[PDB]
Symmetry: D3
Subunit: 298 residues, 6 copies
């Protein structure tokens, strides 16, 4: 079972302008083959299908726990996309919008028109080409080492895509999210690397970084490393998966410092609210009436 905390894993800067194509690119990091939806569903199903949940407990704890962090990862990337697509972030009401004026005219020429037709100027479960995320992006073989090897590759491939998208947009919201998830993804790659080292004797972490560029060279990532977040494997559980430290220990591939397990989730930041977008009829063409109904419920 799962519980939810109404907070993003980190505080994101408020968007200052809509950037459709930046959002379209960031989608690759959400619903693309190596987006957070894939890291999420791969570990989630592997955790469900895990054989030897007690006999190989440290490894089960690891996959089950990281799968839980991934839920926060898709949430964070979705909030980033929504920030890039929000017309009036944080504003509950905008009046005077008239469909006849073609208020969505700009969307006719952007890469991703779905964001404005299927979505109400919001995130969708797809990649940078509009391809919807699909279950075949998941690998759950039941063989522990094979799955771990897949996961190590999965994380470094995912990192590569984040670095490339980072180079496509200088948008502060997108780069803040990328900087943080580069660090978190790096922790996961290191964790699976350590898991493989313990089971096979092969020094997988010595292969890092892939590509051969350090996260320390990415300002937004360095910011979080300076706070020590590359050393933390958060235990996203009230009382379970307490044996993470048996694998998550030793040197960090980033700077060689000792890594540690942090019981409980990160502090986090507030959730994001794109506000009212009348042209998208979201949450309603004119939500005044609905806001009154909600008020009366109290």
């Amino acid at each position: 079972m799962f519980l939810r905390i109404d907070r993003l894993q980190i505080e994101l800067p408020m968007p200052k302008e809509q950037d459709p194509n930046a959002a379209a690119a960031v989608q690759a990091l959400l619903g693309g083959r190596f987006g957070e939806m894939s890291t999420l569903m791969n570990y989630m199903y592997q955790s469900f299908n895990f054989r030897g949940k007690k006999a190989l407990k440290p490894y089960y704890d690891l996959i089950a726990n990281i799968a839980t962090e991934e839920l926060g990862h898709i949430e964070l990337v979705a909030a980033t996309i929504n920030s890039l697509l929000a017309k009036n972030p944080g504003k509950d009401l905008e009046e005077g919008v008239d469909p006849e004026s073609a208020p969505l005219g700009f969307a006719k020429d952007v890469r991703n028109a779905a964001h404005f037709i299927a979505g109400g100027a919001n995130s969708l479960v797809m990649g940078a080409m509009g391809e919807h995320w699909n279950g075949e992006y998941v690998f759950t073989s039941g063989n522990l080492i094979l799955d771990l090897l897949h996961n190590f590759f999965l994380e470094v491939a995912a990192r590569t895509h984040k670095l490339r998208v980072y180079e496509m947009t200088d948008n502060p919201v997108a780069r803040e999210m990328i900087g943080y998830l580069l660090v978190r993804g790096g922790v996961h790659a290191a964790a699976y690397g350590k898991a493989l080292e313990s089971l096979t004797g092969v020094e997988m972490t010595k292969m890092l970084p892939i590509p051969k560029i350090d996260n320390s060279k990415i300002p937004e990532a360095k910011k979080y490393m300076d706070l020590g977040f590359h050393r933390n494997l958060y235990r996203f559980s009230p009382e379970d998966y307490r044996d993470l430290g048996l694998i998550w220990k030793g040197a960090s591939p980033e700077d060689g410092t000792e890594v540690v397990v942090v019981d409980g989730p990160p502090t986090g930041g507030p959730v994001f609210d794109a506000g009212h977008d009348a042209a998208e009829f979201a949450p309603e063409f004119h939500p005044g009436e609905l806001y009154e109904i909600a008020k009366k419920l109290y």
Copy 2:
């Protein structure tokens, strides 16, 4: 953010033997268009994309919270499928399996061979025809009423599929899961129905049940309702979504009794471990050595 509890939403019975085709059918309830992956992802993304999270908080609380319960739903259906595919449930080691003997011969003729090739005799993110779940099964328009209407339909369609699969498999593991999720799905349909009633004045809950057959006619579902589960909307959060009672109140479509918000998750049951299946090399052909490595980690 989210937290995880290593417990299934309910305790599942143990299967007498493997039933591949039963597992193949149950997949429709996991990765199919109206499977739990769809209810999960629809509410999850709608919650992310929700506009007016504070101004329309009662409704946001509802979608955000139910989305969290859906995580337990996919987990439960996956556990059911894994139970149906497990050769030695609860057994850590089986020795003597020889690939030359064609130990997976039976799998050559079952409906879903992927369960035994791509999966190590375990669940996959797909439906009853092998179709992988996809993001287009998600509807997130940004318009509250439109999304709620979609969700009401989504749950009754999902219920219909569970009823049909219930009639295909007599397996107690499958029927226990279905009985429970019929009740939970009913709570969600009722919740979205009440939300629509408050926003539009249209008495959506009076349309229930759909199809026109009561959950009380399904033995397993009836038991869970006798335990009062049709009245419960669990607040799956440490401190958030505390306004669920503003919408989740009034009569239950099942028996007209007063519904209630339950603080926190239910106790549930233990997670499932399919055990060792050497032919599937899961968790390893012979996990003896890996088990020793694990033991040594504890020093």
Copy 3:
């Protein structure tokens, strides 16, 4: 625009019992790449996209008209599949069905479980492997000769699939539909062949039949040819497409006899009603009440 007549293109016999796998195979002839959905959508879109609707009218008439017949083709194949899936064809009500008895147990082991889960034991827009029909099965280039060449190939490929399915299912409902559509498909291939002959001078009809087996060897098809159906190109329109005879003339590839344009649609047969299937909750678990509501509508 279009109009509808509540009649199948031909009368279909009634099945002795359900045959799920026969229905699964026949789906290839509906939603598969070369199923009737493909001939329908290819000609339908080509007709919409046709350039020179007046300057090349004889050819536009042909594609626009055949596209209309294709609507009857998907309807007929769907009716065949529904017949094979019907538990109580022609019966409005069956009482006593209890989900607890696992009334759909047999469906757990058939090839296509979707027919019983997503569908209420009815046709779906897919092929023989559960693959849903998709728009990329359509070719609409805007170039007349290229489209016509594609269409000629499309029909003979479609014929090949029908012949193969004919050899898989001995069911009279399936074979009656196939015998008829082999003849109709043959008329279309002949028509596109004649169109190509007029535009390029290449004697495409002399390549027929493909495969090299005559429709006369298929009993059901032979009967329809004995009724003269291989000579008929029906003008499925009240007043339009009156120039079909400019291309649809001359010898039939089947027997060398003069082909003819028939004014209007054939009489056909009655539509099919699968009846009540309580286990599938179709049209309702127990439709008694709904039937009363319907009766009351007439006052």
Copy 4:
């Protein structure tokens, strides 16, 4: 069985210029998840699979009939797309086009290149992202009420997409089509709503409009409502489905006026002919010879 009338459901204005991206957006209304292909195929298959065709005749008449109108809907949207992609609308011949000059250069940068590569600058069976329409967009459960509930939702979702596309392009051809289909779609939503009301007692039509904006506020839609088209449910059949009036009666959700069944199809307008586009080799690079062959057939 079916018959065809060589007319669009309504007369469309002639396009004055090519607008590729407008056409790309309008595709969402044709081959997208909630495009006319979906309303068409959903009702068409439901009508085929209908159980109790006589015992529940009024409802069968309704679905079977509306499915027939939908055929005209995909035809109308396709004509709209073709109008937006036509270089020389209504002109049988253009000479002097030389491929070496790169006459399709502009298409290299438009959103939908398929329109010009796979299609001969014509409509395709896909959505706004190039996604081809697929059979999983169809819901045919065999359960009457469940199907009707799905259809009610389907129509209001489809309306929402039309409103959004309407706001993306001020193109007269696209807006004329959208205005008319907003009205027709509204009739269908109202019809399914009334069907549900008769079978369940739940006042579904009271939920309209969704989104909360009236079609009367859309000039092109208001135009057709002023002609009374929101009150008409046309019986697209020579002699069948004569019991539509048992469900289609009472007040219109638009203005509360009495709705009625109109026997026979609407008058309609002429079909559209995009003319010759040599660069697309449609209908031929130079159709002069083919035109002569056709002439001789007469």
Copy 5:
């Protein structure tokens, strides 16, 4: 079994600038429904599934051989796409690239962002809309005549797409490739046409050209015809498929001249190397170290 020669089927001009959208369009000729991947896989599988490999040897030789040439066709189109996406063609190292500067900013607005996210600014197995090539684009019925008819259509449809893409970009690399493959594709269409003529008596080659425009009117294609390449059916095999001449003989649909079988593959040209693209971390962020490792291996 197969062997490989490290040469492109023809020498290609070096790209003078990156042209993302041109590359996106050319993808239709690679992974699109009628791209070289389709001609390749259709003939390849038909050759595997061929019944009567000896009893119908001339026809088997034909399909098995052309399938082999198609391998060079996907290679040539891929090299063309890579040429259009190469930042520093032929250069092993570029220094000073800093991700923080958003060096891939331009890619945020191009049609195909996948080229820069999933690919390292390189070709992908997809079409012009980002659709990945799929096995359903293959037709292998086992019936010889049906397959040959399909192949004749396949080649003329493929030609049509090449002509359309040719008209979308005046890029020299793309047009050189298109000119050559128009000629090679024409040979294949003629070959299948002749095969059909021998088996059915129907003069299929008389239907050419389709569309009704001659390759001689395309400068780049005429260039290769003047060298006589439209007359050559190369036998891509050391010692097998020696009976091609039984079908490949007689007049060429292009100019009526006698066609001939050429034993062995064409001379070809050098392979293409897109060089170092640091922003894409290809072959590495900074390959200096890897180049040294390779050097030491020698």
Copy 6:
């Protein structure tokens, strides 16, 4: 460019009879995500997209060359599937087949009906669930180490699928192909492992085998290793890729013996001809006339 030799990479035994479901399972090894189509296309495109073809030649040689061997791999698996689907292997003509007798009746109930409808009882570009192979199964990042890591994983995952299918089908044709490709796949994994060791210092080959079961335990694979095939990296080129030995050297993960580069392709075995299947109209309903036409071509 490429050249073709009309020989399979190994000689395959002849099947005793058709085994449709065995063929359906083997399809996973051809068109499935980890089938030979994936190893082929991954290396093929990586070789096209390779940057630093001269500066990193040893690695380019490796990928370009193995990609060429993969062509023989898809050919071999296709031949295995065709063998399992052949009614009259090696027989040019069967007379008397009558479609009316429902000669393909058995196919109505097999897992993969597409083999008999879309295919003329022959291989298709798909997996074990009918899913068609697609380009997204290809990973070509342009980054050498990332691609090599992917390839190492790709081969061991592919091996795992072959081992599972080996346990599903006891058919000698399937097991001979699997035994051989387990060995060849092992060589490729070893090769990519050695490439990674040279570029990163990480001893990837020490992770082998995955799963933890030796190929020596599979009879058919053991035989090929006894013939020394696990040591061979064939240079599938007339004059190119002559630097394979710079990486393909040292100990074999199988037995620690010195691996070697073999100049040119192996002798292999004859290609497979499924013969005439009249019910499938392949190569023709009755090929008598076509055979005469072919004979006459030789004058």
